[PDB]
Each structure stands twice: as C-alpha cells, then as structure tokens.
Design a protein around this ligand. Structure first.
Ligand SMILES: O=S(=O)(c1cncc2ccccc12)N1CCCNCC1
Length: 330
C-alpha cells in the first residue's frame, strides 16, 4: 500500500504545516501537524477542557463506531518549547492520503497548553519519530508509520514541504519526479528516538564550504533551523545590522535586508536554503525588525534541522531495519 497527502503552511510565514487526517467511522477529518520529532498522535477532542478549545476541529470518539477506549491508558507530553498536552487514549481507524491503519492509538486531549489553544489551525500532532518516544502509559503505543510499515510497498515516508506553497507527505514510495539530481543517504542514530544524523558542514551565501560535523535531528515539527552558536554567528555576520536580541529571544535583522543563502552538507551533497526562506517577518506587527530563521541551538542541547532546512529538500525517512535519511535538491 501507499498514501499521499498534501501538507499546507498554516500562515504566510510557513510557521507550521498541516495535513488532513481521517479518524474514525464515519471519518472525522482533522488537520494535524506531522512531526518527525515526536511520537504521539494526539488530537483536540470532545474531552478537551472547553476553555482550552478555540476554533480547532475536535475528534469525538463517541461518534466513531470503530473507536475503543484503551483501558487505563493515559498520555502526557512536554515539548521543548514549554508547550504540553495530556489525556486518555482510544484505538481507532486512521487514514492519511488513502493509507489506512486500523487500531491506531489516538491520544485524546483532556488538557492542552495555551499555545496550542491559541493556534486554531492545528487540530493535533501526528508523530513520526521512533515509537520509543511515545508517551502512552502504562503500555507504550506505536506511531502511525510504525503501524503502517509492514503493509507499505517500501518502509519509507517522504517529506516535501513547500516554501509559501503546499507540499506533500508520501508513505510507501519515493516519487522520483519530485526532486532533481540524486538522493544522498546518510546514517541515522535512533539512540535518542529521533531521526538523528550528522551533516558534513555548511556555507554562508557564496562563501567557502566549512567541513565540520553537525549532529542534529530532521524535525518537521520545528519551524526554524537551530545550529551551533559559531555557525549561526557566521551566518548573521553576513547580514548588515543583524544582532542577537536577548529581549526578542534570538537573532533579528532589518526587514529591508536581503538575506544570503545557507548551505548544509549531506555527505558530499549540498542542500541550498535560499535567503528568503530565512525571513520570519516583523518581530511584532508594524516593526521594521524581522525575526531570523536560523537560530542558536545553545541550551537546547541538540541541533535541529527544522522546516527552514527541510523545505529546501526532498527528504526520505527510510524506516528499514537500519533506518537512514535521504536528501535531494528539488
Ligand atoms: O509544533 S510545535 O511547533 C507547537 C507547539 N505549541 C503550540 C503550537 C502552535 C502552533 C504551531 C505549532 C505549535 N512544537 C511541538 C512539536 C515540535 N517541537 C517544537 C514545538
């Protein structure tokens, strides 16, 4: 089997991407944030505290004839930005882009933190990291991909995120028309439960490529590109007037600037992020200071190849017995 679904930016800045997912019988379609950095499929629901729902579409398990409460199971997740959610667990039928999994754990939120409530465009998350990170207790549950894998034509999924445009998540096949050149594959460590890999270096604009190992994760659920302070300083030094702002929480730059590209290495291959992909717009409405899309990972404890990086590539998440990651230009 295979599946293919369009993923759409939630706003004009590509702050996140949503993909429609069918849950239950009859189907309830929710727009979920596919997140290769986490491993829970959780949704706003009829059980979510009413004051914490503000415009999201909810899953109502009592209206699904295939939903079954998973007895005694709860979940609770705390993301690296301080946001969180928790609740109970149903199993139900879940379909993405024509690919159907029966018995998928659907984590129904009883509580969500304020930043989820405040984003009416995201109805939940669909985790695509390794199932070792799933938070369901006392019996950990499998991700949608792990449940689908054996049925797929090939045990893979691909992320093709658009810049200011729709894109695609495919399951079970590689669309050879969706990229240019070749796909370069690179080793993955699953030791932290992530799609963790080592980039071979970077360049800023037309500058010389610096060969240096940068360990990080391929994370579709993180908006920005978080890299070591030395690398980020070298990038923003090429933008006149850019500065790290403690009050804002990162590098900012004059909105009138033209940003240089940023290149990262995948083996001997190179992925070029155009400068425009690094502009996240005014820091507050009407400001002429703009937020940068490349930020320091210092004190995160890991480097994160988030959407800013991934949307410059066609990305293969190869879930074979020994997982690997593939990157192609597009
Ligand atoms: O998806 S999130 O970007 C995230 C968290 N809270 C609220 C949000 C509101 C809108 C869009 C995204 C949000 N996220 C959770 C997984 C990735 N880790 C980083 C933080």
């Amino acid at each position: 089997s295979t599946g293919s679904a369009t993923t759409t930016p939630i706003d004009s800045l590509d702050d996140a991407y949503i993909t429609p997912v069918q849950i239950g019988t009859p189907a309830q379609t929710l727009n979920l944030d596919f997140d290769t950095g986490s491993s829970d499929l959780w949704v706003f629901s009829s059980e979510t505290t009413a004051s914490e729902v503000d415009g999201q579409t909810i899953y109502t398990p009592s209206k699904s004839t295939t939903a079954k409460l998973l007895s005694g199971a709860t979940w609770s997740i705390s993301y690296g930005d301080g946001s969180s959610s928790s609740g109970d667990v149903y199993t139900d039928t879940v379909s993405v882009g024509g690919l159907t999994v029966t018995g998928q754990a659907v984590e129904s939120a009883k509580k969500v933190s304020s930043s989820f409530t405040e984003d009416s465009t995201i109805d939940g998350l669909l985790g695509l990291a390794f199932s070792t990170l799933n938070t369901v207790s006392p019996t950990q549950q499998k991700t949608f991909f792990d449940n689908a894998k054996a049925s797929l034509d090939s045990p893979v999924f691909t992320a093709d995120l658009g810049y200011h445009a729709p894109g695609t998540y495919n399951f079970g096949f590689i669309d050879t028309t969706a990229y240019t050149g070749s796909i370069t594959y690179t080793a993955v460590s699953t030791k932290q439960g992530f799609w963790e890999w080592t980039s071979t270096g970077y360049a800023v604009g037309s500058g010389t490529f610096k060969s240096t190992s940068i360990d990080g994760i391929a994370d579709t659920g993180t908006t920005l590109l978080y890299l070591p302070a030395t690398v980020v300083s070298a990038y923003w030094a090429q933008v006149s007037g850019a500065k790290s702002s403690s009050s804002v929480g990162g590098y900012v730059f004059p909105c009138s600037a033209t940003l240089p590209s940023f290149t990262f290495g995948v083996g001997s291959a190179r992925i070029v992020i155009p400068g425009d992909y690094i502009d996240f717009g005014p820091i507050s409405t009407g400001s002429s200071s703009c937020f940068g899309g490349i930020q320091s990972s210092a004190g995160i404890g890991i480097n994160i190849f988030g959407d800013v990086a991934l949307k410059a590539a066609f990305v293969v998440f190869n879930g074979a017995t020994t997982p690997t990651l593939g990157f192609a230009s597009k």
